[PDB]
Structures are given as C-alpha cells and as structure tokens.
Structure 1
Amino acid sequence: LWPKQVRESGMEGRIEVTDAAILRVISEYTREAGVRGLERELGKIARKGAKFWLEGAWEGLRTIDASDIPTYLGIPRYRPDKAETEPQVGTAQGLAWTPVGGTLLTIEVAAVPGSGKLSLTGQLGEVMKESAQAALTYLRAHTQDYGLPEDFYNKVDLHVHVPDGATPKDGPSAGITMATAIASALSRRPARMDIAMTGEVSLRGKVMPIGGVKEKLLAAHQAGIHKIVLPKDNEAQLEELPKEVLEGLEIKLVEDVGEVLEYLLLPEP
C-alpha cells in the first residue's frame, strides 16, 4: 500500500515511514474491516509530504515516525488503544459483523426502580428480547452472589438500547454480552472495557456456541479490542484459523455465564 501511495505522488526515494507510524495510521485515523481507509490515509500523507517537500527539500530522506503523523493528518479521530477509555456502569462491548465492516455493539442497559418489566428500546428483535429474558432468568437463579436483592425482578424496569437499529447479524450473537450488561446494570458496578464478548446464553446458564468464529475474532481486532470471550464449544474452531488472526489476543474460552462475569464484574456488589 505505502509503496503504491508514495509512488502516486512521485516520492521515489524521498519519504520513509517506520512501523510505528503505519500502526498510528491504522489504529488512530481509520476504523474499518478492510484496508480501503488506509489507502486514502497514506495517500493524504503522501500529498502532504509532497507539499512540505515542494516548499523546500531540506532533508535527503524524511523519516515519518509516530510523532509527525498529525502534521500531515491532524487529530486522531479514534483512540489509539481501546484499553484507555474507562470502565462504565451499563456498558458491554458486544461483537457483530455488519456487512459494512465489523463493529462492537455498545449495548446499553439502564435499571430504574419501579413496576418491574422490560422496557425494549433501540429496535430489538424477538430473539434479542428472548436473550434479555434468558439473561434475567439465569441471574434470578443466583442473585445473592452478585449483590442483587432477590426482589429485583418484581420492582426494576430495564431500558435496553441496542445500536444498528434492528439486529445486525440477523440473529442473536450477543448473549453473554447482554448477560454482563444486565448484571452490571442491576448491580450498578462498572463493567469492564477492553474486553469484547459474544456467545449464546441458555436458561440453565450455558454458553451455546456461535457461528463464524473468524468474524467475531476479526471484528474485535478492527475495533481494537485485544481480549475476546468465546464459547468453549468453539475450542476446535480455533484450530483452523490462520495464526495472524490469533496474534495479540488473550481469548477466554468459556462455557458458563458464571465465568464470563468473572472477568467483567471485578466490582460485584
């Protein structure tokens, strides 16, 4: 890519770029599943380099590191690493595969004392509501181990917001995502950032496996999440993926929804 862009603008043997600068362009100036964005970003770097060179060729070979990138681009539109934002109360970084590139569905659920029912916002589907119901049903089996009062279902309304309008995968794939979202919201403790998750939740509290583990392992690299949670029933689904996809990940193969919540719920009560 870069040897094409620096040849678009006639930078033959004039501009060099290190690994850190390309990584800055990747993780700080474009977020999409493909590499179309990096083409135009490196093109803009080439054009700015041609501009700065045309007003004086002082340097024989200009090294562009991860420091002078903004001079050609400006402000990082996205966080460098997603491990720097905050832990939030009602936030669960989901995983999905939107046909326009993978992205994390920040499903947000708010618990308000009141009648006791499920408020269903954000264009849920049938399966999305059933997943919320399944998460509540499991959380009802074990409540005193999460600090909740045993009468929470009788008196707490839950406002659930799922982005991307309807379900993006055209099917439930964020079971444990909603499980941890609702557990944090009901317990009102900061859920963990920096860890995306996906799965299926079953009322006995079992993590049924997902389809297409490759997409749920990519759409967390593109989103910048470097610790993913997967169902244990997909352990053999990690024996055909290329080694590049598995690079940088601390994958927690899980089977219960009592061990997905070991990670995110560091504050239980």
Structure 2
Amino acid sequence: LGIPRYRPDKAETEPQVGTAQGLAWTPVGGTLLTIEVAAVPGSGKLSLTGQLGEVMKESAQAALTYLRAHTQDYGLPEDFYNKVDLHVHVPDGATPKDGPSAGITMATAIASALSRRPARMDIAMTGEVSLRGKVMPIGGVKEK
C-alpha cells in the first residue's frame, strides 16, 4: 500500500511545546482534538476561536482561574493576566455534543504554553471542571 501518513504506535509523537492532545467524543468520530495556543506577548487579552461554543470558553477560564491560583506553582509570572495574550484556537468545535470536556486539556495547553514546557504526547483525557478547580464528573465516559 502507500506510505505511512500517520505516526506509528504512538511512541514518537513530539512532546508539544504548548499543544495538548484532548479527547473527542464527537458525531464525526472519536479522535484527538489537539488544541494549540499562540503564546503571544500583548496587553492581556485571551480570545478563543475555532467554531467553538461557550462551554468550551467557560472550561478554559475555569482552568484559567485554577492557573492564576497557581502562578508560583508553575512557570507563570506573579501577574500574567494583564501582560500576555493567548489566542486559543480549537481544531473542531462546532459540536453540540462537545460540552466543556477539555478544560483540563485547556489547562495542560495553557500551562504548557505559558510555562513554555512540553505538554505531553499521548495522554488522551477528558472531563468537565469546576471554577475553583475540582474536576467535575462527566457522563458518556464510554466514548471518551
């Protein structure tokens, strides 16, 4: 047959500088939704794109409040909220299935990008979050 377009049994996936590898529980098929973030220097905006619904935003700021409670606990500065911009695109977000299931995937993405440290290859993970940080339960753990 033709050439390997995909990676092997995943032991080569390059550690992602800021890109998490999130779960997909989708009409289109289960996959990875690798959310990438432009670690860009600005004056503190944080915008989200990628045909995405609002529960994905609210999971992202739930991870963000958890991040800003842990600025000294990771590579974040003392006050990052007013100094750095984070364009947060998601590859496939026009999904009424997909609720806020990747806020921890958001969290790994944002802390890996702001920390400039590798978000891991090959931990495909999911779960709805609280604001204060408690990983809320989810149903549909089957498809995830």
Q: Same fold (TM over 0.5)?
A: yes
Cα distance change, pair 168–111 in 1 and its aligned pair in 2 (3 A): farther
CA root-mean-square deviation: 1.4
**What displacement does 1:83 show?**
2.1
1:19-64 CA distances to partner (integer Å, 9 max, x unpaired)? xxxxxxxxxxxxxxxxxxxxxxxxxxxxxxxxxxxxxxxxxxxxxx
8 Å contact 2:16–2:121 — kept in the other structure? yes
> Any gaps of 5 or more consecutive residues in structure 2?
none
**What displacement does 1:90 show?**
1.4
Q: Distance in 1 between matches of 2:5 and 2:17?
A: 25
What is the correspondence of 1:164-183 to structure 2 with a 5 Å cutoff?
164-167=92-95, 169-183=97-111
8 Å contact 1:96–1:168 — kept in the other structure? no
Structure 1 stretches of 4+ with a deviation exceeding 3 A read none
Cα distance change, pair 214–100 in 1 and its aligned pair in 2 (3 A): same
1:193-251 CA distances to partner (integer Å, 9 max, x unpaired)? 01111112212211011211111xxxxxxxxxxxxxxxxxxxxxxxxxxxxxxxxxxxx
SS in 1 for 2:20: strand
8 Å contact 2:25–2:98 — kept in the other structure? no
**What displacement does 1:121 show?**
1.6
Q: Distance in 2 between matches of 1:132 and 1:123?
A: 15
Query: What fraction of aligned residue pairs are identical, expressed as a percent?
Result: 100
Name whichever structure is richer in helix by fraction.
Answer: 1
> Any gaps of 5 or more consecutive residues in structure 1?
1-72, 216-269
**What displacement does 1:165 show?**
4.1
SS in 2 for 1:182: helix
**What displacement does 1:98 show?**
2.1
- TM-score, L = length of structure 1: 0.51
Higher relative contact order at CA 8 Å, sep ≥6: structure 1 or structure 2? 2
What is the aligned residue count?
A: 143
8 Å contact 2:26–2:98 — kept in the other structure? no
Larger radius of gyration: 1
**What displacement does 1:168 show?**
6.0
8 Å contact 1:96–1:169 — kept in the other structure? no
**What displacement does 1:153 show?**
0.6
8 Å contact 1:97–1:168 — kept in the other structure? no
SS in 2 for 1:92: coil
- TM-score, L = length of structure 2: 0.91
